[PDB]
Amino acid sequence: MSLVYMNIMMAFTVSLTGLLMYRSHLMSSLLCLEGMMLSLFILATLMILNSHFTLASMMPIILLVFAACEAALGLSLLVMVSNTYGTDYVQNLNLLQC
Amino acid sequence: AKTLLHQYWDIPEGTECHRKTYAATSIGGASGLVVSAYSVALKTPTSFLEGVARTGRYTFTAAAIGAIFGLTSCISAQVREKPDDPLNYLIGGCAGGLTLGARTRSYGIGAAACAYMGLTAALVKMGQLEGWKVFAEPKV
Amino acid sequence: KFYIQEPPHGSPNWLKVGLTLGTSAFLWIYLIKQHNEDVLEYKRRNGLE
Amino acid sequence: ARQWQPDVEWAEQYGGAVMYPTKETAHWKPPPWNDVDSNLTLNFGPQ
Amino acid sequence: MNLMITLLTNFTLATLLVTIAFWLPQLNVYSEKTSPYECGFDPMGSARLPFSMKFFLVAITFLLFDLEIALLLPLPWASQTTNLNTMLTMALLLIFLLAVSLAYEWTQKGLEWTE
Amino acid sequence: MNPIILIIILMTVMLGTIIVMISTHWLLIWIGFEMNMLAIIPIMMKKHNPRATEASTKYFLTQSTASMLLMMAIIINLMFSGQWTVMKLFNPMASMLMTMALAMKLGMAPFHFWVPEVTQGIPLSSGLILLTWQKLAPMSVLYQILPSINLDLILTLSILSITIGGWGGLNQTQLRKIMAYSSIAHMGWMTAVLLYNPTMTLLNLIIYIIMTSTMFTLFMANSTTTTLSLSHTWNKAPIMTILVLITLLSMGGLPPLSGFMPKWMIIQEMTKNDSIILPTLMAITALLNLYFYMRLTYSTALTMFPSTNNMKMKWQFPTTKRMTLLPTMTVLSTMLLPLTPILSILE
Amino acid sequence: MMTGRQARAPLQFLPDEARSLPPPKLTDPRLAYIGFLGYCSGLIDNAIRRRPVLSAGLHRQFLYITSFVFVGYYLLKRQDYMYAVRDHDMFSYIKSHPEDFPEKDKKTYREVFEEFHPVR
Amino acid sequence: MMTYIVFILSIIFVMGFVGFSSKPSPIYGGLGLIVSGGVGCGIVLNFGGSFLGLMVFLIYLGGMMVVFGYTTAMATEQYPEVWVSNKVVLGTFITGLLMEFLMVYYVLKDKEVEIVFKFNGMGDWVIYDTGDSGFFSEEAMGIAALYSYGTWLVIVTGWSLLIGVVVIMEITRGN
DSSP states (O other): SSHHHHHHHHHHHHHHHHHHSSSSHHHHHHHHHHHEEEEEHHHHHHHHHHHTOOHHHHHHHHHHHHHHHHHHHHHHHHHHTTSSSOOOOOOOOOOOTO | OHHHHHHHHHOTTTTSSHHHHHHHHHHHHHHHHHHHHHHHSSSSSHHHHHHHHHHHHHHHHHHHHHHHHHHHHHHHHHHOOTTTTHHHHHHHHHHHHHHHHHHHSHHHHHHHHHHHHHHHHHHHHHEEEEEEEOOOOOOO | SSSSOOOTTTTOOOOHHHHHHHHHHHHHHHHHHHHHHHHHHHHHHHHOO | OOOOOOOOHHHHTTTSSSSSSSSTSSSEEEOTTTSSSOOOOOOOOOO | HHHHHHHHHHHHHHHHHHHHHHHHSSSOOOOTTTTOOOOTTTSSSSSTTTTSOOHHHHHHHHHHHHHHHHTTTHHHHHOOOOOOOHHHHHHHHHHHHHHHHHHHHHHHOOOSSSO | OOHHHHHHHHHHHHHHHHHHOOOOOOOHHHHHHHHHHHHHHHHHHOOHHHHHHHHHHHHHHHHHHHHHHHHHHHHHHHHHHHHHOSSSOOHHHHHHHHHHHHHHHTTTSSSOOSSHHHOOOOTTTHHHHHHHHHHHHHHHHHHHHHGOOHHHHHHHHHHHHHHHHHHHTTOOOOOHHHHHHHHHHHHHHTTTTTTTTTHHHHHHHHHHHHHHHHHHHHHHHHHHHHHHHHHHHHHHHHHHHHHHHHHHTTTTTTTTTTHHHHHHHHTTTTTTTOOOOHHHHHHHHHHHHHHHHHHHHHHISOOOOOOOTTHHHTTTTTOSSTTHHHHHHHHHHHHOOTGGGGGGGGG | TTTTTTTTSSSSSGGGGGGGSOOOOOOOOHHHHHHHHHHHHHHHHEEEEEOOOTSOOOHHHHHHHHHHHHHHHHHHHHHHHHHHHHHHHHHHHHHOOOSSSOHHHHHOOSSSSOOOOOOO | TTTTTOOOOOOOHHHHHHHHTTOOHHHHHHHHHHHHHHHHHHHHHHHOOHHHHHHHHHHHHHHHHHHHHHOOOOOOOOOOOOOOSSHHHHHHHHHHHHHHHHHHHHHHHSSEEEEEEEESSSOOOGGGSSSSSTTTOOOHHHHHHHHHTHHEEEHHHHHHHHHHHHHHHHHOOOO
């Protein structure tokens, strides 16, 4: 295909390996998730802008929009842990094993 | 891993020994790496050294399993001079079962493994002979 | 007067059973009418009268 | 004489956290029955 | 290209002032001028303790209202469209959805503060 | 929970499922999936417990990873194909990423590491809503893209799902983990036949939904979440023991019950393609599932466990709970065998 | 696999061709079995709510029987419509392609060779 | 090495992504992703996407200003690590930078790498158009027909954002 496509998809899988290997913090994983979505948005916008698809130009930003509509939910899924545990370490999140 | 099995089956059986033995050893090594990676994934090793010790243990055990299985099949098919007979693969399956019992330090496990992967090796051999398909393509 | 209180199901709610009877009658009448419409439309569609 | 019925030993055999207690699942307590499980000191100083 | 030149010139002028402010005068430091400032006394603990912040929902709903802004922002070019009725009806609909979210926040006690 | 807000939440999750059902666009598919996520999330947090928060965090993280993989598959398909129609895909790697996304969303093994904790940490009605309503939209997406599905990948995932579900269900005392591993086994049985005849997949999905909803309704009626309380149900009512026995016999796979109806015909659509050893292996793991089902039936109905003295108070009050269509779903889960050819309505 | 037939015109329970088929009679054994299913469902409601099983709520039993018979009749209509569509597409394709499906000359037993294995 | 401006911006994108993918601390991860988003917005502006680049800029600034407020509110440790205060953070950062330079050296040498798909070493400007779109920009009418052509999409987006508001209100109630 090209070169910047390779760079963007490699950034996506780099951020995927960042998310799929935790480092004892939930919000850092949320940041990696938003990075994966950044790579997705950048790839989609570049693909459209190369292919002159005008009417599909709504799809990137709306994609972006919906990501925030879940990302805040992840933040809303953080303080509740902070309302039960003192911190937000994932190794403390092992109550569901019995 | 689609080429290891085919390279195992690309050589006529019971004709040459070391290449078939090393092909089976490589298949066993790939399986051992897969199972050891899963074992260190779901179960946390206490240290890096103990984790790589477990990985090497599973790799060595599965490599010995594959090497002895391929070897025993090779000398069995050479001695009986019967390439199209699954009894050689049953004998190799019991050889692998004795290997598993030796590396795991058990005897009843060795006999059960004899029976179980001897039957598995026989099923593989008549699957090759009769052309059975594990994953049949859709026809109707 | 056996029970100390009045149970909710100790009295026949006539509206509920009337609605159930009306719904059952409507379903049966619609079923026979649909069956008749189907059978004479079948005899019309093939001329097997 | 009559039909055998389960005693407290059978029922407490079925009462474990897991069906077959292994070497790892020894501290696994059963879940609860009802499914229910530093303010900042600031000095307004003189300056 | 000119935007890049302006950015580089602005960054060069910014980072030249701190370098002038740092390596020109004479430095003389002890282990009290570098101490944290707590109005003349020692700090009680560290500032890395978790703040019991009370407007978490206000920050999240600021994010959500900014995405409402992102939906409402390409409206001027939609003024040049042909199908004006659908444009006006749905711009009013989206503004009404924003107002519905704000009114639900108002009624269900969200714009106030915790504790 | 507010009843109006709860009704709005339920209308949102059903609207998201309907949007996934009816859309001919990949972006609208993902929008419906996101709405499904965002509406099912507060259903699990109806009780405000730490277990619910842990389950919600695990579910949200896994489904977010699945959603991002789905978006990358969609973008790859767009870039190699130039359109957005929901049909066969034009790249094997996009097919890989979408298959992993749908396997993560469904809970199929080896991505089964989130279903039992999520089912355990949430109440029974939320577990019903999860294990029934989340298995409709990914099945529709897999129904749409079955030309592009790799055969070896889906068959390996299916056999791994059935084996892992049986081996998981052999060693769980909690009812909800039993339900989760049984759901994994039914998922593997249902998705093994997808490439040969998707009507069999739809039929097995319908029967599994009916039986699982029947069992969760019986658990809600008895208000029991443990094996010992389920055994203690014999003193409260004998009819509940009769229905739990006949239903858990139905999900085992015994004739002439309805649970023998799908699985047997799965073989009827796999011997036509000359696949012989795979239905035999899946029948053996179905026997394993029947084994842990038989242990559970021995616990609840066929042997009456000792009870306590408090239950006499419960003898003075009838069950005032609302059993939603319980006899109809029990009858459909038990005696649907003589109406076997009715699956032809699903064509 | 009939989706192509349900491709041009969707979400139709009974299309226009379904009216040209003979509808199932009310004395069909399948309809009687579904009515028995509804009667059993009514008995289960009389059982599980601690009511008398054979006399309590005749309106509920009649409603169950009627609803079961209604949905069973419509599902059986859809079933026989789909099976007729299957056989009609079958015969249409077997008229359409005679080159890929030839005829067979059924030989007599006076000349076809068979191997006899003795049992002893 | 002039017309590789898109390549250079993409390399800074991958560098920042490797930098914040180590997950050292939410503030420093936000800084690394913000550098990455800045050069990604630069990519989109260099491809003519003024509105999309500025929109992703503004959205990311708002979202991780909120993330900054949250990590300074609750998710904080006593001694946050920058990049070198812990061993595995620096290890995976150096590892990711080494693989980044690995395919940099792979793509500037043979001009055709094969990672899943095949990739070329020329800049993307070769695919950009030679025609002129008159007195207008096409993406502007894309986001303008967002309101006229885009009926179902805008309806479901607004309903999903309203549902997000009501869900986020319902989650952090406690009772």
